[PDB]
Amino acid sequence: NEEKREELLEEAKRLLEESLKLLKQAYNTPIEIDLPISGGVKAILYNGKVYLIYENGKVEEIEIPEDDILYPIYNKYIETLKEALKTVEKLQEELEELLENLSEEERLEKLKELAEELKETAEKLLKSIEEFSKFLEELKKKLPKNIKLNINYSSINLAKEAAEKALEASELLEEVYESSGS
């Protein structure tokens, strides 16, 4: 049955690599929003900064006051993504060290710890994603019928797929832990 455990562990490692990749891509991917009644201006959200890019090619970095409704939600999303990136990289390093390596029961405990932290991080990320998506959908509802907002959900979908892959890896690690501790 150790071969089954090996298959599950390597699948979890693969899913963790994929999760880290998708998380870095999501952090790199900016949130684009074609602002309305502005002469085809696009509001780009990148690294906690807001940029207006005009059709002619002008780009202005606009500082958003801490009081606007968008700043807190977007910053919470950014910070959750950043913290998830750090946590996932830490857990990846720990799982690699585990696979390389003392005490089988301690390794079972370590796998349980890894999976629990992975699950918590994935669920917090999904929670932040849901909050930000609800905010954006309400923002688009607060608009006239003719006026339409075209948002590029690339980063949000990347983050959601990454959180789901992390959850899958966590549940695979949990299967390993259960089938081994018993």
Author numbering: 1 to 101, 107 to 187
Report text from the authors:
Unique membrane topologies, such as those from G-protein-coupled receptors, are not found in the soluble proteome, and we demonstrate that their structural features can be recapitulated in solution. The soluble analogues were functionalized with native structural motifs, as a proof of concept for bringing membrane protein functions to the soluble proteome, potentially enabling new approaches in drug discovery.
We started by designing soluble analogues of the claudin fold, a class of proteins involved in the formation of tight junctions, which are critical in controlling the flow of molecules between layers of epithelial and endothelial cells. Claudin folds are composed of an α/β mixed secondary structure in which there are four transmembrane α-helices and an extracellular β-sheet. We tested 13 designs for the claudin-like fold (CLF), of which ten were found to be expressed in soluble form. Five designs were further biochemically characterized; three were monomers in solution according to size-exclusion chromatography with multi-angle light scattering (SEC–MALS) and were folded, with two showing a melting temperature (Tm) above 90 °C. The CLF designs showed sequence identity below 13% relative to the native fold and nearest e-values to natural sequences below 0.063. The CLF design series showed that our approach could be used successfully to design soluble analogues of membrane proteins with simple membrane-spanning topologies such as four-helix bundles. To assess the design accuracy, we attempted to crystallize the soluble analogues of membrane topologies and obtained high-resolution X-ray structures for one claudin, one rhomboid protease and two GPCR designed folds. The CLF_4 structure exhibited exceptional design precision in both backbone and side chains, as indicated by an r.m.s.d.Cα of 0.73 Å and r.m.s.d.fa of 1.28 Å. Comparison between CLF_4 and the native claudin demonstrated accurate secondary structural element positioning, with an r.m.s.d.Cα of 3.63 Å and most of the deviation arising from the β-sheet region.
